[PDB]
Amino acid sequence: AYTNSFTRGVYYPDKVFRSSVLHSTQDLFLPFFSNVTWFHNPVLPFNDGVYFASTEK
Amino acid sequence: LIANQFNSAIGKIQDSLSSTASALGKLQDVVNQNAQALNTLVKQLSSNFGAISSVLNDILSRLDPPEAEVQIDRLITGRLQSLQTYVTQQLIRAAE
Amino acid sequence: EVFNATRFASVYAWNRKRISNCVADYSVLYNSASFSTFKCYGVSPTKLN
Amino acid sequence: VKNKCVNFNFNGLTGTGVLTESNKKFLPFQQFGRDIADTTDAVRDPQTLEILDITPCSFGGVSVITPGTNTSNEVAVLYQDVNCTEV
Amino acid sequence: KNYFKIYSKHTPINDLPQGFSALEPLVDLPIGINITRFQTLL
Amino acid sequence: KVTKFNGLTVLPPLLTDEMIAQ
Numbered sequence: 001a002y003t004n005s006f007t008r009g010v011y012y013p014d015k016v017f018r019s020s021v022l023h024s025t026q027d028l029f030l031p032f033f034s035n036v037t038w039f040h041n042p043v044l045p046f047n048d049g050v051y052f053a054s055t056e057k
Numbered sequence: 058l059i060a061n062q063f064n065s066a067i068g069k070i071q072d073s074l075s076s077t078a079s080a081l082g083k084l085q086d087v088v089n090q091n092a093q094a095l096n097t098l099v100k101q102l103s104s105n106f107g108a109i110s111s112v113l114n115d116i117l118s119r120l121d122p123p124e125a126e127v128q129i130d131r132l133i134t135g136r137l138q139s140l141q142t143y144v145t146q147q148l149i150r151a152a153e
Numbered sequence: 154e155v156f157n158a159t160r161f162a163s164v165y166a167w168n169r170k171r172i173s174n175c176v177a178d179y180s181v182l183y184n185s186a187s188f189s190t191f192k193c194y195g196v197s198p199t200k201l202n
Numbered sequence: 203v204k205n206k207c208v209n210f211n212f213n214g215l216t217g218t219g220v221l222t223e224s225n226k227k228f229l230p231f232q233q234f235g236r237d238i239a240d241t242t243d244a245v246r247d248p249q250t251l252e253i254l255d256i257t258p259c260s261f262g263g264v265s266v267i268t269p270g271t272n273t274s275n276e277v278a279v280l281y282q283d284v285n286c287t288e289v
Numbered sequence: 290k291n292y293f294k295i296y297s298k299h300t301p302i303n304d305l306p307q308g309f310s311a312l313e314p315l316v317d318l319p320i321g322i323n324i325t326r327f328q329t330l331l
Numbered sequence: 332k333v334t335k336f337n338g339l340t341v342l343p344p345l346l347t348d349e350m351i352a353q
C-alpha cells in the first residue's frame with residue numbers, strides 16, 4: 001500500500017530558540033508529498049532515517 | 058469648471074494613494090536596498106572565511122597566541138573584505 | 154580507567170571508551186611528564202581545564 | 203547577578219551583556235535563543251532552569267561639540283544613543 | 290536519524306491526516322551503533 | 332504606506348519629520 005505524506009515529518013533541527021524568523025536549514029528531512037509505505041510486520045531498511053507514524057486504537 | 062476639475066483630481070490622488078499602495082516603490086526600494094545591504098553585512102559575521110570557528114571568543118579561549126593568530130588573521134581578512142565591500146556599495150548608492 | 158589501563162588493543166582493532174559525567178582536571182594529564190608528546194589540534198594544552 | 207554588563211560564562215559560552223531573566227518559551231531541551239540576525243540571546247544556566255535575556259552593555263560613539271578654540275576652550279560632549287543615567 | 294536522536298510528537302486525529310505538526314525531540318542516545326535495518330514490534 | 336549591536340549605530344536625521352513637514 002502507498003499514500004502521500006502531505007506535509008508531515010518536520011522536526012526542530014537544533015535546540016536554539018527562534019521567533020517569527022523564517023529560517024532556512026539543510027539537514028535530513030522527509031521530502032514533501034512523498035511515497036510512504038503503509039503496513040497493517042516485515043523488517044525494513046534504515047537508509048538515512050525514518051519517519052515512522054502510527055494510528056492505533 | 059477649473060476648480061471642480063482640480064478638486065476632483067486631488068480626490069483621485071487621495072483614492073489612488075490610499076488604495077494602490079504600490080505607488081511608493083521608489084522610496085520603499087531605497088529602504089529595502091539599505092536593509093538588504095545591512096543584512097548581508099551582518100550575516101557575513103557568522104562565516105568562517107576558512108578559519109576553524111566563526112566566533113572570535115571561541116577561537117581565543119581554545120588556542121595559543123601563535124595558532125590563534127593564524128585563525129584570527131583569517132577572520133580579520135574576511136570581515137574586513139566584507140566591510141569594504143559594503144562600504145563601497147554604500148558609496149555608490151549614496152552617489153545615486 | 155583509560156590511561157593506566159593494563160593493556161591496549163591492536164592498532165587496527167582499537168577500542169574507543171567515551172567519557173562523560175566528569176570534572177576532568179586536564180592539569181594532571183598535562184603536567185604528567187609520562188606522555189611522549191602533546192600534539193593538540195583543535196585546542197591549546199593550556200586551555201582544556 | 204543581573205542588570206549589569208557582566209562577563210558571563212556558561213559551559214564555555216562567553217561574552218558580555220545585561221543578563222536579564224527572560225521568558226524565552228523554550229522546549230526544555232532547548233539551550234539558547236536567537237533573533238532575525240542569529241545572535242546568542244539566552245542560555246540555560248547549568249545549575250538552574252533559568253533562561254535569561256541578553257542585551258550588550260551600551261556602547262556608542264562620543265562626539266565633542268566645541269566652539270572654535272579661537273573663541274574659547276570650553277566644550278560639550280555628546281554621548282551618542284545612551285539612556286545616560288549610565289555614563 | 291544519525292547520532293541516534295529520536296524526535297517525536299502526538300496528536301488526536303480521526304489514510305494519513307493532511308496537516309502539519311512539528312517534532313519536538315524526546316530522547317538522545319550517545320552510543321554509535323552501525324544501523325542499516327530496523328523493524329517494529331507488536 | 333512605507334514600511335544589530337555590532338557597532339551598527341544609526342544616527343538620526345538632522346531635520347525631523349515635523350520640521351520637514353513645516
Ligand SMILES: *[C@@H]1O[C@H](CO)[C@@H](O[C@@H]2O[C@H](CO)[C@@H](O)[C@H](O)[C@H]2NC(C)=O)[C@H](O)[C@H]1NC(C)=O
Pocket residue numbers: 058061062
Ligand atoms: C469640457 O469638459 C468639462 C469636463 O469634462 C465638461 O464639464 C462637465 O460636463 C458634464 C456634462 O456636460 C457635466 O456632467 C459635469 O458636471 C461637467 N463638469 C465636470 C467637472 O465634469 C464640459 O461640459 C466640457 N465642455 C465645455 C466646457 O464646453
Ligand SMILES: *[C@@H]1O[C@H](CO)[C@@H](O)[C@H](O)[C@H]1NC(C)=O
Pocket residue numbers: 002035
Ligand atoms: C509512488 O506513488 C505513486 C502514486 O503517486 C504510486 O502509483 C506508486 O506505486 C508509488 N511508488 C511505488 C514504488 O509503489
Ligand SMILES: *[C@@H]1O[C@H](CO)[C@@H](O)[C@H](O)[C@H]1NC(C)=O
Pocket residue numbers: 248249250251
Ligand atoms: C545541581 O544541578 C542541577 C541541574 O540543573 C540543579 O537542578 C541543582 O539545583 C544544582 N544544585 C547545586 C547545589 O548546584
Ligand SMILES: *[C@@H]1O[C@H](CO)[C@@H](O)[C@H](O)[C@H]1NC(C)=O
Pocket residue numbers: 271272273
Ligand atoms: C581668532 O580669529 C581671528 C580671525 O577671525 C583672529 O583675528 C584672532 O586673532 C583669533 N584669535 C584666537 C584666540 O584664535
Ligand SMILES: *[C@@H]1O[C@H](CO)[C@@H](O)[C@H](O)[C@H]1NC(C)=O
Pocket residue numbers: 285286287
Ligand atoms: C532610562 O531607563 C530608566 C529605567 O527604565 C527609565 O526610568 C528612564 O526613563 C530611561 N531614560 C530614558 C531617557 O530613556
Ligand SMILES: *[C@@H]1O[C@H](CO)[C@@H](O)[C@H](O)[C@H]1NC(C)=O
Pocket residue numbers: 323324325
Ligand atoms: C555497517 O553495516 C553494513 C550493513 O551491511 C555493513 O556492510 C558494514 O560493513 C558495517 N560497518 C561499517 C563500518 O559500515
